[PDB]
Amino acid sequence: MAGAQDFVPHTADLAELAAAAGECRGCGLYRDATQAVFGAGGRSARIMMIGQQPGDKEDLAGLPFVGPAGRLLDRALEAADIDRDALYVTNAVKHFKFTRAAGGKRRIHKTPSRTEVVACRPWLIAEMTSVEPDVVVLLGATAAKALLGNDFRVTQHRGEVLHVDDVPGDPALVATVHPSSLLRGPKEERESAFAGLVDDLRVAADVR
């Protein structure tokens, strides 16, 4: 009766799950978005990565992390010697929540409410039980709070391997900055922040 749960089929197959998510009406976000954007990768992945939501490029590509934030993430993964093809990557919510400004060059993402995050979380649980990752990288506040609690502060736990007792399979969790946050700002601050993202990715990759 709650959120996305009745839309989630009783299967761990990622292709089946993604097809079903295309029909989800578990919150209001399906209405204005072009399509649901499920995760990408396969069930043998040892590392799962979760962002906030599909953005403007992802909403139309049908794949996660294809825009500028995704290209920065690719650069950080390469510096961390992680092959993106070996990951399962997804987002805490699966429809793009957005507005447009007059004169704007893109659709502008808006923050999912906690209500929307909780509504969509059945998909994330299905992905986690399907993939059985050894470690989950939480990119940004929305994703981290989805699993660690609404009060959790990414800025206060950088570099730490976390484990919480009601996440399925008890994977390690590593919460880090979202790559979109490193696209703008002073040069020295962007460079320090990028190095910190590489460090956190390496923490995740060194898990068992």
Tell me whether residue 157 is annotated as binding.
no
Closest by alpha carbon to 57, among 73, 34, 40? 34
**Phi and psi based region of residue 137 (left: phi greater than 0; alpha: psi -120 to 50; beta: remaining):** beta
User: Which residue, 94 or 145, is less far from ligand SF4 as judged by CB?
Assistant: 94
Q: Reading across the β-sheet that carries 47-51, which strands appear in turn?
A: 88-91, 47-51, 135-139, 172-176
**Residue ranges in contact with ligand SF4 by CB under 6 A:** 3-4, 21, 24-27, 29-30, 36, 93-95, 116, 119-120, 123
End-to-end C-alpha distance for the chain, whole angstroms: 38
Tell the smallest beta-carbon distance from residue 80 to ligand SF4 (Å): 29
Tell me whether residue 163 is annotated as binding.
no
Tell the smallest beta-carbon distance from residue 53 to ligand SF4 (Å): 8
User: Which residue, 59 or 200, is less far from ligand SF4 as judged by CB?
Assistant: 59
User: Which residue, 130 or 157, is less far from ligand SF4 as judged by CB?
Assistant: 130
Closest by alpha carbon to 46, among 117, 134, 108? 134
Tell the smallest beta-carbon distance from residue 18 to ligand SF4 (Å): 11
Tell the smallest beta-carbon distance from residue 90 to ligand SF4 (Å): 11
Report strand pairing: 135-139 vs 47-51: parallel
Binding site as annotated, residues for [4Fe-4S] cluster: 24, 27, 95, 120
